[PDB]
Ligand binder design. Structure first.
Ligand SMILES: OC[C@H]1O[C@@](CO)(O[C@H]2O[C@H](CO)[C@@H](O)[C@H](O)[C@H]2O)[C@@H](O)[C@@H]1O
Ligand SMILES: OC[C@H]1O[C@@](CO)(O[C@H]2O[C@H](CO)[C@@H](O)[C@H](O)[C@H]2O)[C@@H](O)[C@@H]1O
Ligand SMILES: OC[C@H]1O[C@@](CO)(O[C@H]2O[C@H](CO)[C@@H](O)[C@H](O)[C@H]2O)[C@@H](O)[C@@H]1O
Ligand SMILES: OC[C@H]1O[C@@](CO)(O[C@H]2O[C@H](CO)[C@@H](O)[C@H](O)[C@H]2O)[C@@H](O)[C@@H]1O
Lengths: 407, 407, 407, 407
């Protein structure tokens, strides 16, 4: 068997972050940290699944807390965002549980499919798969932490500043009052307690991580797939000015076909996650873009909103762009195959060129759409159209302005 | 001749539900229950056509009843839905009469085209065609009955509750008063009578069945077509790791071409029904989605509206998804044909791959659009755009709220 | 030389209606009635060009009259329709002058290209080209005459009824007063005179004829091209169950390529006309659809408005559908070519199938769009979106209602 | 080495205008005027880069001047255009600096790629590359000068006329007062001085040139690329009725492939410039189209607005049309290759036809969209949709009308 310890494989590149996601109980797999991917299994009776049940239960408590709170105070387009957030996180937990069920099969086919690319004539690029996944994961994790850190600073400063500069109701600032104030939707159903207070803080942070891991997981998966397609393209580039034997083209076509089979298998497994992530990002991007003209009290509120908005747009763009790289990388070998000399031309090149030319090699949201650069352009155009129409809806609330600080 | 009694054919799978539709006189064919499809004929002078005339006449009476009533009370965007419903049902009767005229030719070509798939190397799947059609038909029929049952319960409870809790005009509840109240558009033109009262109830239920059978018929037809394409794909999957003789690929291509010819014949026959169903579903989905924010008096009204809305959206989605399965199943054999070894490669595979790759094998609305997964995504995007623009129109009536119960 | 007298050619099919258009000086060609198309020439110094100059001068007089009138009374979205109409008629005159300049070459290439289809193995269909063109042209001309007659009847009845039922300002009805009232935009610049009155009536009729003849000419050209494409399709259908020699396929491919070259030439010649017709039809359809909910005084006004709207929508739809018939007929031979046996298969069939599959054989608006059924569906969707957005603009004037009769 | 002095090369055609752009420090390249393109180099320590720093610094001063001014007086959808203009110009400077970095590589591959087309069997067209670039450049430069000349005349006349016909505040007209009045956003931050006054005038003119050179540069680049594709098409047209040796098709395919490689290299280098130009043009076209119904005081204001609007729309259209000519010219050789006789048919023609047919040979905005005629149609449709929705936003300000002259 191959030595999985040091090979540049996808499983080695993502397991550190898959295990990290298991800390918040995202995808409950057993033995995800094993060097051999064949040891990865899904078991309902396991510690990872138990933690997932705890997080799903507690997340449902927050969802019910928000649901009951909104009913008491009425449901408006601005309060509905909170309910959608918890609903999306709960859907993510379910989607990732199903993805956990299919992962052992996916990782097994992925490993045996990518073994040929770990040996010549394929060469490891300047930035290996582990480094590519780490940079994307750390960037998303780092930006997500800053986004949540700004959220807490913005909420805390707004709370304290309102009390301090009130010349009115004082309610001396404290951790207890802040929790009952900013998280009223929770404590309006459950009795307050410092133990519960920190639990809500941790689980809201966990919900934030889950909301961000959907996009991160798609990025790491996209990085792993476009990594091998790039290697195929690099190998083809080595044949630009040479007479190529028909055997070489047979291997290239077979490896390309195997990669396409793996993408189809991975696409089917992740079809629901892509669909959930795309709709979740579209709603929040549209929702946030509708509040760009709204007036906020403190500069920190502006900093958080624009950091949150830019990060959300950037995260959405890079999910599509990283996924679209699979499509772009597949078509990059076409330009070199078209330069094949007349003597080297054979049926295998004709077969390969036809497949690259006519096949859409990309991840898809249940085949309803394919993650390509054209789709991201279409998504941007769709968002602009929605915002132009939706901004008329928000004109009344926009002109009301910010409410009095004391009130 | 083949033994049609026990063969797994399309005619056997749909005739039980085609006959059921003939009870409400949808598609007036003679001998639809015959085991031999060659005995199915269309005759104007026949009992099925007579019943169709009766239902068409009575449905026209309801259409005129609604038309005259709206003129007396004015036509608004909310009352126009009732006129569209009866107009769509009448169009369905005409469309199905024309489809009845073409059915004998369609069922004859369908039967002789699918005979090859009833014998090896084609194998019956886990769920045969009869079971696939039954599950779809019973699900649609069962959901449609619940949708109408909720409509009657919602209407009856609203009627009785308004009278009971009025402390005002009493008009002691009775079957007679309910009929004159909720169905005023009928009795405002025809004299009331208990015999007419039940007739309106039955024919409105029949109109509901016809409105739902348009989508059901497209589903059963789509199930029958994707059934054979799936068998072709399954047969191709049996050749993944084998050296295939050129004769095998000749048969596969010929059977695939014959299936494509049948789809073209079926698509032309059903082009009007698909077009009518799509426009009918689009209007009602858009109309109902415009009333999600409206306030209803009783919880039963909310239950009916959301059951009606979700069922309508689900029915529309599954019509497109079931029809799109023909397109998806055609492209599923491409992945296996691309794995054909270099020795097994021949002109027949090249011909077949080119046809699968470049031909759009799907049902179409008069070729204006093709029922694919991309179209359903486009339909959803179009509906969202219309609702965002149309919700501005409905804002005034939305803020008026529900009227006083007694008034 | 071939006997042009009795051959089933496009020039024989269209020259009667081209001469009828010349009677209103649309396309000023010399010898359009000649049996030999080679005798058709474009000359600036000719009677047709003189009549075209006269009609253009008078149409410009009407356009300036409307422009000055609107400037005096202000320009509104409702008043701009007449200025757009006159500008479109003038643009049609210019475009048809250019098309006349290009027409000798177009007709010569068309004649030398369609000669092969006048002899076996091609057969004249049930409805020959002359009959198809006659049916289309007579339908369009009769509908346009009915539309203009309804317009005149509606205007005259409105005027006379306003005068008679006024119990107020009388201005006893007369031809002079009617002309000065309904055509004030003309006589507000030129002195009134009965000669000028009848001239204005005749020239407005001519403008209507030109506006309809743009679409009529597009229809006749589309019929002429789809005729030969259908002949090719029928010849291919004649080979469904036969072993075909390579020479037959060579001839079929050569004829198809010649037809495609002719289509490219005709599209280059008529791109400006197609673009102008499409934009004019889109604008007028949107404008008329924006007035469906408006309230008109007399039933004759409703009859005229709805006849005009339905005729305009049907004319646009039939222009698009007749043009897309070329694409449909080009693609219809693919189904039969795909059934070619393995023994009859050769390089020529592969070339022909590739051309039919990958080439878009259709008329285009300067290549910005191609007249296909997908394009008609997209046009319908775009019109729906534009109407949904614009009905908000017209809500105020819609709720203002009809003005007092006497006022 | 080839004699670059008199050869009809791209570098010779554009360097006169690239050098002119360097006067306003657009693309800081060293030795752009050298006959040999290999002498063109990019150096940060050079005079062209120094001038770019000066213009970038001063443009940033104007951007800050506008930014601070808007904050003092509030940011509105009408005031934001000025900030976008300076932001786009600054982005253009950065984009062109990066393009300057890549230009030496681009011009080197471009020169060696186009050498084959300077010798038979390729012939220089009626209008050589230098003439084609000159006509486009002079037209854009000439129209841009008129657009700015009208802007200054419109601003000066409005300023003087307001003072002269005021019967109120006089502030006798002078150069000093005009600068402090129309350019208050600058002098509200910097002290006024006649030296600064002219500097602002020159740099605003330079900013206008930079805003127009983005489109001009794309045009000249598009002209250079479609020039060689047209030569390939012309060479193929020379083989319409001849028996062609396989060697000829090898050369044609190799030259076509080399041209496609050059387009890919050029497209990647100019991907950011195309993206910036498209978004900049879309915003300004949409912004200006929103003010067509606004009322301006003097006719000169109307002349400037409509000259500015028509030029902006025309410039945007011709950028897309000139770029789309690369796509159109690539597909023009297909029609002749399809006429290749059966004896001349070979694998090379099949390879070439497949590439022309299936490859999208066009410039792209980072592959998000391709500059084709379909895209320009889509752009026009998108603009119409935005304007219809956005015109509702601008209705309030539209009905306010022009403010009092004295006020
Ligand atoms: O469901 C509302 C709930 O979300 C919280 C949880 O901490 O904030 C998260 O969700 C927001 C979007 O709804 C994000 O903007 C934010 O970054 C994220 O932390 C709370 O704001 C709220 O209680
Ligand atoms: O035409 C209005 C008419 O439709 C009825 C007939 O029973 O209800 C049917 O049509 C509704 C949509 O218009 C559906 O929501 C409903 O499920 C269906 O039964 C009556 O409501 C009405 O008289
Ligand atoms: O330009 C306005 C002018 O058009 C007239 C001329 O008879 O009517 C023609 O144009 C209308 C659309 O603007 C059509 O509806 C009508 O069918 C056609 O006759 C007059 O209405 C008007 O003076
Ligand atoms: O940034 C606003 C600034 O642009 C100026 C600079 O002269 O005018 C240029 O920009 C306008 C669009 O914003 C163009 O219409 C105009 O043609 C161009 O000269 C000034 O108007 C203004 O100070």
């Amino acid at each position: 068997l191959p030595n999985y310890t040091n090979l540049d494989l996808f499983h080695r590149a993502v397991f550190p972050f898959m295990f990290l996601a298991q800390c918040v109980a995202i995808m409950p797999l057993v033995g995800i940290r094993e060097s051999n991917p064949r040891r990865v299994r899904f078991a309902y009776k396991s510690i990872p699944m138990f933690v997932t049940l705890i997080f799903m239960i507690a997340t449902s408590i927050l969802f019910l807390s928000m649901f009951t709170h909104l009913l008491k105070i009425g449901i408006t387009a601005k309060n509905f965002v909170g309910l959608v957030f918890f609903g999306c996180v709960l859907s993510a937990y379910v989607v990732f549980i199903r993805l956990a069920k299919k992962w052992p099969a996916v990782v097994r086919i992925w490993t045996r499919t990518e073994i040929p690319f770990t040996k010549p004539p394929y060469e490891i690029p300047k930035r290996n798969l582990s480094r590519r996944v780490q940079l994307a994961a750390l960037a998303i994790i780092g930006l997500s932490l800053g986004e949540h850190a700004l959220y807490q600073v913005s909420a805390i400063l707004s709370y304290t500043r309102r009390i301090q500069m009130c010349a009115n109701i004082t309610t001396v600032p404290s951790f207890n009052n802040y929790m009952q104030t900013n998280y009223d939707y929770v404590f309006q159903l459950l009795p307050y307690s410092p133990i519960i207070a920190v639990l809500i803080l941790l689980i809201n942070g966990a919900c934030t991580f889950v909301w961000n891991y959907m996009d991160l997981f798609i990025m790491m998966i996209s990085k792993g797939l476009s990594y091998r397609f790039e290697q195929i393209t690099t190998r083809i580039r080595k044949l630009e000015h040479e007479e190529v034997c028909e055997s070489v083209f047979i291997q290239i076509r077979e490896h390309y076909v195997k990669m396409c089979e793996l993408l189809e298998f991975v696409d089917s497994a992740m079809s629901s996650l892509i669909l959930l992530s795309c709709v979740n990002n579209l709603y929040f991007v549209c929702y946030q873009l509708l509040n760009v003209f709204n007036k906020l009290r403190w500069p920190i509120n502006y900093i958080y909103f624009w950091y949150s908005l830019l990060y959300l747009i950037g995260r959405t763009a890079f999910v599509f762009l990283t996924a679209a790289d699979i499509n772009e990388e597949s078509k990059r070998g076409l330009g070199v195959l078209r330069r094949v000399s007349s003597r080297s031309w054979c049926v295998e090149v004709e077969r390969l060129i036809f497949q690259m030319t006519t096949q859409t090699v990309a991840l898809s949201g249940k085949k309803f759409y394919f993650l390509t650069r054209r789709l991201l352009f279409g998504m941007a155009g769709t968002i602009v159209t929605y915002e132009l129409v939706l901004l008329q809806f928000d004109e009344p609330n926009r002109r009301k302005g910010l409410q009095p600080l004391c009130a």
